């Protein structure tokens, strides 16, 4: 097994527009959505087939009840936040909780909040503390740090419970999550602006989205400016990316323990 992660996000919007829900919560195993809930449907639903087939209705029932409570607490927390900042109009409140089970078997845990898309409060499970960005965040921190039981509960959920759910879902989603689709790499050369030649190293059809791409001149790194293309979803469960240089050059690609060289 390579590096895998479990995350849950919560989005709260005060006074939303016509369509948009007041509350949304989505879960992810790596880049894959797994679960969904909002203040319109008011139901926790699967977003992956391997979740729908492996978790019995009792799971969806219990978590729907939990999410309805969380929805209400999020609406109250954003009202208090807006009041502290002396803010009117539409504002956002976000949370992200999660996991990582690393290749070496070690683990990571994170719990963070954002107000208007900016960092607000960051949990430190090692010192059992909240890191505050400003004085509003400092006021909230003090209230949260007074409840020692909740801090301890949060450390146990992050270190133990989250990892156990992650290991559970990785097993259900094994045919998707643990697969490898190797990349199709090509080099395209072109005389661009009258004097310069641009070289493009392009990869596609790969899964997982983690790919390492670089250009090397004579076996050593490129001191010149390398342009990088974003790792983009192709729409079929696979990804694409590129790297480019201007002018013995060679493209180097690393994906799932396989190194590829394309000499020009």
């Amino acid at each position, epitope marked *: 097994m390579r590096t895998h992660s479990l995350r849950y996000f919560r989005l709260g919007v005060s006074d939303p527009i016509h369509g948009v829900p007041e509350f949304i919560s989505v879960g992810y195993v790596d880049s894959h959505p797994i679960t969904t809930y909002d203040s319109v449907t008011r139901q926790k639903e699967p977003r992956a087939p391997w979740m729908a087939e492996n978790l019995a209705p009792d799971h969806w029932e219990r978590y729907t009840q939990l999410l309805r*409570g969380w929805q209400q607490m999020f609406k109250v927390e954003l009202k208090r936040l807006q009041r502290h900042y002396n803010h009117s109009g539409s504002h956002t409140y976000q949370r992200m909780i999660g996991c990582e089970l690393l290749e070496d078997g070690s683990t990571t845990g994170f719990l963070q909040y954002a107000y208007d898309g900016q960092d607000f409060l960051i949990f430190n499970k090692d010192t059992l503390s909240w890191l505050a960005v400003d004085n509003v965040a400092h006021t909230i921190k003090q209230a949260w740090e007074a409840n020692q039981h909740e801090l301890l509960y949060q450390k146990n959920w992050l270190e133990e419970e989250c990892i156990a759910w992650l290991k559970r879902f990785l097993e259900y989603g094994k045919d998707t999550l643990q697969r490898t689709e190797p990349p199709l790499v090509r080099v395209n050369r072109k005389e661009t602006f009258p004097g310069v030649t641009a070289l493009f190293c392009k990869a596609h059809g790969f899964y997982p989205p983690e790919i390492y791409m670089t250009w090397m001149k004579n076996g050593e790194e490129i001191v010149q400016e390398i342009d990088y293309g974003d790792i983009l979803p192709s729409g079929d469960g696979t990804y694409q990316a590129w790297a480019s240089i201007e002018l013995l050059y060679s493209c180097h690609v690393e994906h799932s323990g396989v190194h590829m060289v394309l000499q020009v």
Partner: antibody
Amino acid sequence: GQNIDQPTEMTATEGAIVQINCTYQTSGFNGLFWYQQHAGEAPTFLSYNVLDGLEEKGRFSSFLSRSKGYSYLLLKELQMKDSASYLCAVMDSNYQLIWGAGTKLIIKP
Amino acid sequence: GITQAPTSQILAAGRRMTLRCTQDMRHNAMYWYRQDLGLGLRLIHYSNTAGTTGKGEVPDGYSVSRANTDDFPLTLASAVPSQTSVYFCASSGGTNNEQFFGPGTRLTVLE
């Protein structure tokens, strides 16, 4: 979860020490609670444990070992007033509080 | 903190009964348990916040509503002798925290 086990009854002498054991077999773990329920009254909160260790609150101490799925409530310098039922409750992965049948503690004067 | 009404009741089987539960702590989560000899506390129904209810381990023969944060009524639409028990109402601030129990209601259903 599925099972919380604590003895039905325990008898000890006044001024002595008693350790009330609780083993749990749950699907996930989000904390262990100990409550005291005097005959004919409501249960009242004694302690919460979620991480490994012993927590002292006067004559009462609660211990937890997550790897063993085991807790104990230790009562020192036993008084007649300590004659009550002691309930063990575990919060599983679905945030459902699972209650043990309770341990009736009898104190010999 | 929590009050329950009535605290004692004898009911003829087939009759309707409503156990009332009021809290003042503005706790979001509310619970109804039944306590019978040899068993623990068995959850009948729960409510995580105003406007939602869930079924517990023993929901049959009972119904609940949660229109407001403060109240959580338990209805027995047609009482049966097996509904003879001690009923406790409980509340918690959140879903991960400790429960505060109401005094209890001793209900006896007779043929």
